[PDB]
Design a protein around this ligand. Structure first.
Ligand SMILES: CCCCCCCCCCCO[C@@H]1O[C@H](CO)[C@@H](O[C@H]2O[C@H](CO)[C@@H](O)[C@H](O)[C@H]2O)[C@H](O)[C@H]1O
Ligand SMILES: CCCCCCCCCCCO[C@@H]1O[C@H](CO)[C@@H](O[C@H]2O[C@H](CO)[C@@H](O)[C@H](O)[C@H]2O)[C@H](O)[C@H]1O
Ligand SMILES: CCCCCCCCCCCO[C@@H]1O[C@H](CO)[C@@H](O[C@H]2O[C@H](CO)[C@@H](O)[C@H](O)[C@H]2O)[C@H](O)[C@H]1O
Lengths: 1024, 200, 100, 200, 50, 50
């Protein structure tokens, strides 16, 4: 292997060339995304029941679909809501690993079997099955700057001219139009109806009858009479297209011959399908378009391509139309890629400079600078084969991996140089001798480090999804690095390096230093017991720093965005909430004029559902280069927003920086589902909710425990005295349908707009006649003998309560409660506290865990089991390396060394025990294990080839390994130093990784060079 | 009917969602609102069964009510709330009060007058017994290429979970189950393997 | 529906939803005065046709709330297509006892 | 097509689509019909059932196979525009009114089918290479002629043509990669940069 | 170089499979009877002259 | 419904569309007076059930 490629550099260079070529191919074919997919696939069905209440949706739509949702492979759980915007949403969550395509088609097929049971209106409008995502490539805002177009005009334009061309851009995945478009609106006037003795159902039926598309067959059609010499398709009846045609629909003819027409009884015109929402750009009318990235496209070219096509076709936008980009994540990924390339090139330069510093030999420095680029390019080639992408997690993997692959390069070339100088041999024999002292240790290093990293790759859940791209990129790089150290770099050393014939202050200072270090190694050996008590002191410090250091998933970057949740008091209208949102937008664009680029407002939506009392503000900040200073960052803007709007009576305003990966929520968070297991009813379930919440807010183990949804809100009930109506000759159907068409509106049929597109037709009362309960009495319905009866004859009304949002989990009514574990407390013990509270709820109220707490429950004893497997295989690999059941202990004990340094750096800088901290800590612990492995290996080989004692062997091996250890630590600390001291985008993550690894490398290398030989002599003394 | 209803309303749908359960059969059903017509009484009031089916469909309804102050509203409207008009009927008493006729003397005929109303089965096709006593039976059929032991263990676990909410007196037995056999045969061949180890 | 109605209201709508298909090669489609829409999606050689079909169906769900209600109700049909007109059987009645 | 007819390079160039066809529109004067006592629905449905036919429901054939039931006008009555006169619709009083009383004919021209290639309106053309010419030479002739078409009319190649273009344009790159691989393989096998070169 | 560039390009040769197609397209608006008669023209030629 | 009604209005209607299935092995249908139509279609071993 190593000795094989030493004798043949051509073959080793052919292999290096193949790796380099394949690496370049992967450079140009790998996907680009900010993050890999994390959360398990979820499929959601949505339904709209125009004008239906939350209860009506739950009973006529949600429960039917749920009862039909079975035979879905890998189902984890199912969660649905039903709300007052007439909306049903059913989300089915599948187990990690499920093929999302198969989950979607399985869900869609059960839904297709369910569809006939559903209300006719729901069926006619259409149901949606879609994959639930939380991320977008871009979101475009089509804005009318001069006011020429309203949101309906804008959304209509997008659907007519933009959505189709955009969909054909390579790499574009889903394209979502946030925006409603034109519909024929028939606004009935009740009094004009009564005067002509007509009902809303008359209008709907006339529309159903006159707005029709009729198949005309053909002239000369088959079978034809013999002798016919012409075919031709015949066209008879076409959909109505214009408001005039709809108004000219014939409704009635009086005896005197006059005709009653729809124009005589309603206002007819183009409007929107829905008025439930309103969206504004910087106070302008706006329509939004979300572009989601196709699977395994590169985000950067896709986004560049989309902006290019939009620029291309903006040449033909009508006057007053502009396109803005309120949401764009791709600048930040481009910046991550530039930053990683910068670090990798810096790392190559650092290995050059460090080899020259300690060796002052150009020829020896060039070997690592060939080897490192080859391994990095090969790593890209392997990433391509394995299905990874270029993303922030994998890119940080490469950043952490240079510390392992430069260590391999330095070990090889430095050990060849030492043998070649101290023993005076020519290059081929020198490399053979030097690579016969490390090849087995390098094989052992690869196995031990892979073992170190498998508890990470095999971790389950979304957190494991974070880990594995990261850790497996590190593992790929490391294994290739060991192969390159045994294939290319020995041949490069044997062919490149020449014999050595015949600053100086630096050489003298390093030699003085290594002599003082050698004497210190002896000091610690002779004082073993004192430093073993010190070792236990380090272990105790590791524990106390670890417990005190805050938990986290990813550090929260300033990505140039801020989201504002707006919740106004119950019953608020679109007009009233529009003014809290208008206040916020005006505030952002005047007081924060120099910080804020866009403020995009939508009322009608929270992040958790719809409601007139609820809205969101999406605010984009100015380019990061025009946003210097601490006052100009997003965190300070969130502080100033708390200040302005905490003292605000009209609305609840929550400013916040969006999390990088929202599906993870908060590391301290818990997600709970309180369920009606005995059919006890909504009132009983909310009684239980309020009981449980009252208990939780008193509970020191818990904090911030809130009910994820809404309290019951007042509603107005229309009571029809059906028998009084029937005594009047009025049938229940006429009453309910007249009332429903007037108030809830009705979808009648489709029509063909003047642009050739199919749109929906609605009849509802004109607004002045359905605003107030009094209006309910202005409406008329006919009796079985003709003539009109008023609702006041048989209808009264009264106020009550009802839920505006009804939640269901696994098919039974539920209420989701969400909270955090108290500071210093774990999520598992928080779950136990919640469970002991739930036990104290009335019989028949059950509960389930959902989200990340469900994930935690499923994989409970996995983390400890994986650690044991890792430790065992590390131990077994080292026993094979050392042929000893006791010597591996001198290596394994290196672990807390360096861990103390990482914890110390993080706590002293206020950072957190996040995923970045953890992966960095693993690589530094891996490097300390490697440094200890080579120290112990040389101590062993000296003890058995020059018949030394344990202390003599330990001291000489420490002399031998001191230089390469210091070389690697210097290169690595300098390499990550720019991340640990960073200004600009992504600096929180760069800090999260860099601070930890600098602390780790410092304490790891110093405590290791002093204590590893002491441990070696101690294990030799204790089990020999 | 009560046992079939409990199973249908609390066990069957979640069990039907377990991975590996291919399909689920209830020899029984959830409750059905049952309307048993009397023809002589129908003749008395000049009514046909279609009159009855039509009245149920018109008077057993959930009606979209739209909103007070809903959208699009006249400028200045500052209150909105959902309107509830008509709801599904819930008990046989409510169905018995559905209106069928206005007859000459002013009386109104109601469904209670022409039928018996009560909760029963969607179907009266089945009769199941466990050891000669009434039972509600759930047949679990394994999905194609699914693992019998895994699925059976999961469903037994979900049933163990649901047992926490059983009404007083409700018991669950497993009359037919082949996975104990497969599990025990694999267990037995393992036992023979170890006996053969000692013997060698 | 006319050819233009079909193309603009059925065919174009179905095509718009076809973004993000793995291994897309091209697509060609017809819209006739018989009311018929036929959209044929061609993938890269070697693409799994079964995966391609499941993906096309999953994308087609997006089109149904946009499609004309009648088309969405009547049903769209998705199939693995071929032009390999393999063999044609011609059934003949030589004694004349049966016509077309 | 006119250009291809004279290009000696190629033969049998034909459109794979359909020319514009004459079309016939039926204009109903709905006001006359309402004045004469017929609803728009009645006339719509009668003319569709008569001309386009209707699939009503299934029947069970004498062979035991379910088959369809169709209603349409007999051929002599649905052949020419002049025929559309004989169809009567009865009005709200039970009287009959004829089609000639309220409907008019209108000739026009239009497309029988529209083609889209990757979302762009298109027309497909197929052809053969003339005897003595290859498929590729025919495609070069086709591009030369398309170059002379009005600005804005572009083209693509599909099917066999597309795959042919892939083949022809990828071969030189594959030859280059193949030469490179043989070079590196012999370089490795024979530990020399001079042997593979003297071979290549 | 010149011999490669000069060589006409193709994908696959046209093998005689023992089968042939004849596509017939009559003026738009023509009837089934008219096309039946052109198809018969082709069938008669193939079955008598060929 | 009777077994014959079930066969004429459901089972034959569904069966006439069970064509174009990859790996079709055989098909077995039953129609009964309980109003049930059951059509089981068996495929070759190794056919993907999805
Ligand atoms: C047109 C306007 C400009 C474009 C808009 C940008 C849209 C894409 C950006 C990210 C959207 O991602 C969305 O973000 C919000 C806040 O993180 C998440 O919401 C999360 O937190 C909020 C409150 O903290 C809860 O209501 C909810 O339980 C939880 O899902 C939501 O789960 C995710 O779905
Ligand atoms: C050298 C060749 C080794 C073989 C290849 C595998 C490489 C790494 C080894 C990891 C072994 O795989 C690991 O197994 C354990 C034990 O079942 C799993 O844990 C699971 O099972 C046990 C019981 O069975 C439960 O207690 C626990 O809650 C559950 O998560 C864990 O989720 C998985 O990750
Ligand atoms: C199997 C395990 C248990 C047996 C342990 C055997 C060794 C214990 C001997 C005493 C330890 O402490 C010290 O050891 C070192 C060994 O180099 C000696 O001191 C010196 O010896 C060598 C000379 O060869 C020098 O090169 C070295 O710089 C110095 O340490 C000296 O003898 C004693 O002052």
């Amino acid at each position: 292997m190593a000795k094989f490629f030493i004798d043949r550099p051509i073959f080793a260079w052919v292999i290096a060339i193949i790796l380099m070529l394949a690496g370049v191919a992967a450079i140009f074919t790998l996907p680009i995304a900010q993050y890999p997919t994390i959360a398990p696939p979820s499929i959601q069905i949505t339904a709209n029941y125009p004008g239906a209440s939350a209860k009506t949706v739950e009973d006529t739509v949600t429960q039917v679909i749920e009862q039909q949702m079975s035979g879905l492979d890998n189902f984890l759980y199912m969660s649905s809501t039903s709300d007052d915007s007439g909306n049903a949403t059913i989300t089915i969550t599948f187990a990690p690993g499920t093929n999302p395509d198969i989950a979607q088609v399985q869900v869609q097929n059960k839904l297709s079997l369910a569809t006939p049971i559903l209300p006719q209106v729901v069926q006619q409008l259409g149901l949606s099955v879609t994959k639930s995502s939380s991320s977008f490539l871009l979101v475009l805002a089509f804005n009318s700057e001069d006011g020429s177009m309203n949101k309906y005009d804008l959304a209509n334009y997008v659907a007519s001219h933009v959505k189709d061309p955009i969909s054909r851009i390579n790499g574009v995945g889903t394209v979502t139009l946030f925006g409603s478009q034109y519909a024929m609106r028939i606004w009935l006037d009740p009094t004009k109806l009564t005067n002509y003795g007509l009902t809303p159902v008359d209008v709907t039926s006339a529309i159903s009858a006159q707005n029709v598309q009729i198949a005309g067959g053909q002239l000369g059609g088959t079978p034809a009479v013999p002798g016919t010499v012409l075919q031709a398709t015949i066209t008879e009846a076409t959909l109505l297209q214009t408001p005039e045609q709809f108004g000219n629909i014939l409704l009635k003819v009086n005896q005197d011959g006059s005709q009653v027409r729809l124009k005589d009884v309603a206002q007819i015109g183009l409007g929107g399908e829905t008025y439930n929402f309103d969206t504004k750009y910087n106070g302008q009318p706006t329509a939004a378009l979300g572009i989601q990235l196709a699977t395994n496209a590169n985000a950067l070219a896709t986004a560049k391509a989309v902006r290019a096509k939009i620029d291309e076709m903006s040449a033909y936008f009508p006057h007053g139309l502009v396109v803005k980009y309120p949401y764009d994540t791709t600048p930040f990924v481009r910046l991550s890629i530039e930053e990683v390339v910068k670090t990798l090139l810096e790392g190559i330069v650092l290995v050059f400079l460090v080899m020259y510093l300690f060796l002052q030999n150009l020829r020896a420095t060039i070997i690592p600078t060939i080897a490192v680029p080859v391994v990095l390019l090969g790593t890209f080639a392997i990433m391509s084969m394995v299905g990874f992408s270029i993303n922030v997690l994998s890119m940080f993997g490469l950043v952490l991996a240079i510390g392992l692959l430069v260590d391999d390069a330095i070990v090889v070339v430095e050990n060849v140089e030492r043998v070649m100088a101290e023993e005076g041999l020519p290059p081929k024999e020198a490399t053979r001798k030097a690579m016969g002292q490390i090849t087995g240790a390098l094989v052992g290093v690869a196995l031990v480090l892979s073992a170190v990293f498998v508890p990470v790759a095999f971790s389950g859940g979304s957190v494991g999804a974070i880990y594995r791209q990261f850790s497996l990129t590190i593992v790929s790089a490391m294994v290739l690095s060991v192969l390159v150290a045994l294939i290319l770099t020995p041949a490069l050393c044997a062919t490149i390096l020449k014999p050595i014939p015949q600053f100086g202050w630096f050489n003298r200072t390093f030699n003085s230093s290594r002599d003082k270090y050698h004497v210190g190694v002896h000091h610690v050996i002779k004082r073993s017991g004192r430093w073993l008590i010190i070792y236990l002191a380090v272990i105790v410090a590791v524990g106390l720093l670890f417990v005190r250091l805050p938990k986290s998933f990813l550090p929260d970057e300033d990505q140039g965005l801020m989201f504002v949740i707006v919740q106004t008091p119950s019953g608020s209208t679109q007009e009233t909430t529009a003014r809290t949102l208008a206040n916020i937008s005006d505030y952002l664009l005047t007081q924060e004029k120099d910080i804020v680029e866009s403020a995009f407002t939508v009322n009608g939506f929270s992040f958790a559902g719809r409601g007139q009392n609820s809205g969101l503000v999406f605010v984009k900040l100015k380019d990061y280069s025009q946003r210097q200073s601490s006052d100009q960052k997003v965190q300070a803007l969130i502080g100033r927003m708390f200040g302005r709007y905490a003292g605000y009576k009209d609305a609840l305003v929550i400013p916040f920086n969006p999390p990088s990966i929202p599906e993870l929520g908060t590391a301290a968070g818990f997600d709970f589902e309180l369920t009606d297991n005995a059919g006890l009813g909504h009132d009983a379930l909310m009684a239980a909710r309020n009981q449980l919440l009252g208990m939780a807010a008193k509970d020191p183990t818990l904090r911030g425990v809130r009910p994820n949804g809404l309290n019951d809100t007042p509603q107005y009930k229309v009571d029809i005295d059906r028998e009084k109506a029937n005594a009047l000759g009025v049938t229940a159907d006429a009453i309910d349908q007249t009332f429903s068409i007037a108030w809830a509106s009705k979808y009648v049929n489709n029509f063909l707009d003047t642009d050739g597109r199919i749109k929906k037709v609605y009849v509802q009362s004109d607004a002045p006649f359905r605003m107030t309960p009094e209006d309910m009495n202005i409406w008329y319905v006919r009796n079985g003998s003709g003539g009109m009866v008023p609702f006041s004859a048989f209808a009264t009304g009264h106020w009550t309560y009802g839920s505006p949002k009804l939640e269901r989990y696994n098919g039974i009514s539920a209420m989701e409660i969400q909270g955090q574990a108290a500071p210093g407390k774990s999520t598992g013990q928080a779950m136990t506290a919640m469970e002991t509270l739930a036990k104290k709820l009335p019989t028949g109220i059950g509960y389930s865990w959902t989200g990340l707490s469900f994930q935690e429950i499923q994989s409970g004893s996995q983390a400890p089991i994986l650690y044991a497997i890792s430790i065992l295989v590390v131990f077994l690999c080292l026993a094979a390396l050392y042929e000893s059941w006791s010597i591996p202990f001198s290596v394994i004990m290196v672990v807390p060394l360096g861990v103390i340094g990482a914890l110390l750096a993080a706590t002293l800088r206020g950072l957190e025990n996040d995923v970045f901290f953890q992966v960095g800590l693993l690589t530094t612990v891996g490097l300390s294990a490697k440094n200890a492995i080579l120290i112990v290996e040389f101590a062993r080989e000296l003890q058995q080839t020059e018949n030394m004692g344990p202390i003599e062997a330990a001291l000489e091996a420490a002399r031998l390994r001191l230089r390469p250890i210091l070389m690697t630590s210097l290169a690595f600390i300098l390499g990550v130093m720019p991340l640990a001291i960073s200004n600009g985008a992504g600096s929180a993550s760069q800090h999260a990784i860099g601070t930890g690894v600098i602390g780790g490398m410092i304490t790891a290398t110093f405590l290791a060079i002093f204590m590893i030989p002491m441990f070696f002599v101690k294990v030799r003394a204790v089990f020999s």
